[PDB]
Amino acid sequence: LVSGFEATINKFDKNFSAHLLDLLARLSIYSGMASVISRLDFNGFYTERLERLSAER
Amino acid sequence: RATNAQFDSPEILRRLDVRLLEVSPGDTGWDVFSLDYHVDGPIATVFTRECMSHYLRVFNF
Amino acid sequence: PVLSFLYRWIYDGELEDTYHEFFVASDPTVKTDRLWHDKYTLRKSMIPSFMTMDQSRKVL
Amino acid sequence: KSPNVLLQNLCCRILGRSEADVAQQFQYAVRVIGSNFAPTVERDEFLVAEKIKKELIRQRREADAALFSELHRKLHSQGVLKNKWSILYLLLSLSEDPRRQPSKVSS
Amino acid sequence: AAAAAANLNAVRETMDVLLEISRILNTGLDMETLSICVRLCEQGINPEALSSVIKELRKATEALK
């Protein structure tokens, strides 16, 4: 079964990436103090690929 | 770290910090970068506020 | 009494007057780095005549 | 004066086109002004004044930053506008860097 | 009234003052367009929406070409 394996892995992967980007966004407001952000993505993937565009408000 | 200024005592290295002078689009990066080098303690009475403003003008030029 | 106001203002910078009998003019709540700039102003009526101006600028 | 024709004067000030030439832009203009007719950010004219000051300090035109304090004074002196914070933010939001400005206007 | 006409002279002054503020902040607006914006701000309006208007209308004149 790969709907009990691969699709479930993808659901978990989607949720983990969502939690990760929300964590990094809520971590960026926090001013070795910025080493917490640097250590989690030292290679520079999975961090702020989107800036979250500003509305016409 | 790459240049030679790491023979300095840690106090003045801690006193300096980059100061922004406010976002304005259409303005190149050279004009907004200046160190602050703030001063606290009993020595601050010699280095008054007006002195720091005149040093900022000197830096900008 | 002015020789007990001009015998401790010379040494330890200790003074206390309620009605002003001495040329210290304090500014309240100045204990920061404005202490070197304020809390003292040479009042020109409470300087006795046997003194001179330089004597009063030094004790301050 | 009604605000809908007042906004229609605005779209013929920016554009050169007439109001029987374009009505497609003005429909989009009410689409953005409408339902965003109340402040989307909090107001203070004090903070916005200190950012027109900090821009003139950035250009080292700091004699004009204290001339600006009288220009911010005149808007209080009439007192017919209460949105004095808005128009200062508006010229600040559309602000650019000339590197220098000479031959001052006002009065 | 009379004071309601002297204030018209004094808001004619204030528009030129805002024009000086417009040129030292380097914004492409004149006396005429600002005169629409002050009447709009009397009824109450967002500068955040007017800035988006001005950033879109100047960048959609070559979309009506």
Mutate to test the interface with B, among D47, D51, D57, D62 (most CBs of B within 10 A): D57
Q: Do D32 and E57 touch (CB under 8 A)?
A: no
Q: How large is the C-alpha radius of gyration of chain B? A: 14
How many Å lie between the alpha carbon of A55 and the closest alpha carbon of chain E? Answer: 10
Q: Which residues from chain E sit within 8 angstroms of residue D68, using beta carbons? A: 21
Give the phi and the psi of residue E41 in degrees, each rounded to 5: -65, -20
Resolution in A: 9.2
Tokens 């993937």 found at: A45
Any C CB within 8 A of B51 CB = no
Cα–Cα distance, B44 to B53 (Å, whole number): 14
Cα–chain center distance at B7: 19
Asked if C38 has any chain B CB less than 8 Å from its own CB, the reply is no
B25 touches chain C (CB under 8 A): no
d(CA E65, CA E63): 5
Burial of D66 (0-12, 13-18, 19+ CB in 10 A): exposed
What are the chain D neighbours of A56 within 8 Å (beta carbons)? Answer: 32, 36
Q: Distance between CA D13 and CA A4 in Å, rounded?
A: 63
DSSP state string for E13-58: HHHHHHHHHHHHTT----HHHHHHHHHHHHH---HHHHHHHHHHHT
The amino acid that residue B43 corresponds to is I
**Alpha-carbon gap: A3 to the closest alpha carbon of chain E (Å):** 47
Nearest CA in chain B to D91: B24
Q: Crossing angle for the helix pair E47-57 and D84-93, nearest 10 degrees?
A: 30
C-beta neighbour count of B55 within 10 angstroms: 13
What residue spans of D15-62 are helical by DSSP H?
Answer: 24-33, 45-58
| CA separation for the pair D8, D19 (Å, rounded) | 8
Q: What is the DSSP letter of B19?
A: E
Nearest to E46 among D1, D16, D36 (CB): D36
Q: How close does chain C come to B39, measured CA to CA in Å?
A: 11
CA distance B52 to B31: 18
Cα–Cα distance measured from residue B26 to residue D107, given in angstroms and rounded to the nearest whole number: 28
CA–CA gap between residue A22 and residue A49 (Å, rounded): 12
Burial-class residue D87 by CB neighbours within 10 Å (0-12, 13-18, 19+): buried
Q: Are E54 and D48 in contact (CB under 8 A)?
A: no
Dmax over CA atoms of chain D, in Å, equals: 47
B44 at the C interface (CB within 8 A)? Answer: yes
Distance from chain centroid for Cα E42: 12
Within 13 Å of residue D1, how many CA atoms lie on the same side as its CB?
Answer: 13
From the CA of A39, how many Å to the nearest CA of chain D? Answer: 35
Smallest Cα distance from E43 to chain A, Å: 18
**What letter represents residue A33's amino acid?**
M
Q: Do chains B and D touch (3 or more CB pairs under 8 A)?
A: yes
Contacts of B44 in chain C (CB under 8 A): 33
| D14–E contact, CB cutoff 8 A | yes
Partner B contacted by C54 (CB < 8 A): no
Distances (CA, A) of E10 to D73, D106, D107, E20, E36: 13, 12, 9, 15, 17
Task: Calculate how close chain B gets to D42, using CA atoms only, in Å.
Answer: 19
Q: Residue E45: which of C56, B20, D3, C4 has the closest Cα?
A: D3
Report the C-alpha gap between A52 and A56 in whole angstroms. Answer: 13
C touches B (3+ CB pairs < 8 Å)?
Answer: yes
Residue pair E49/D36 in contact by the 8 Å Cβ criterion: yes
Taking CA–CA distances from A56, the nearest residue in chain D reads D32
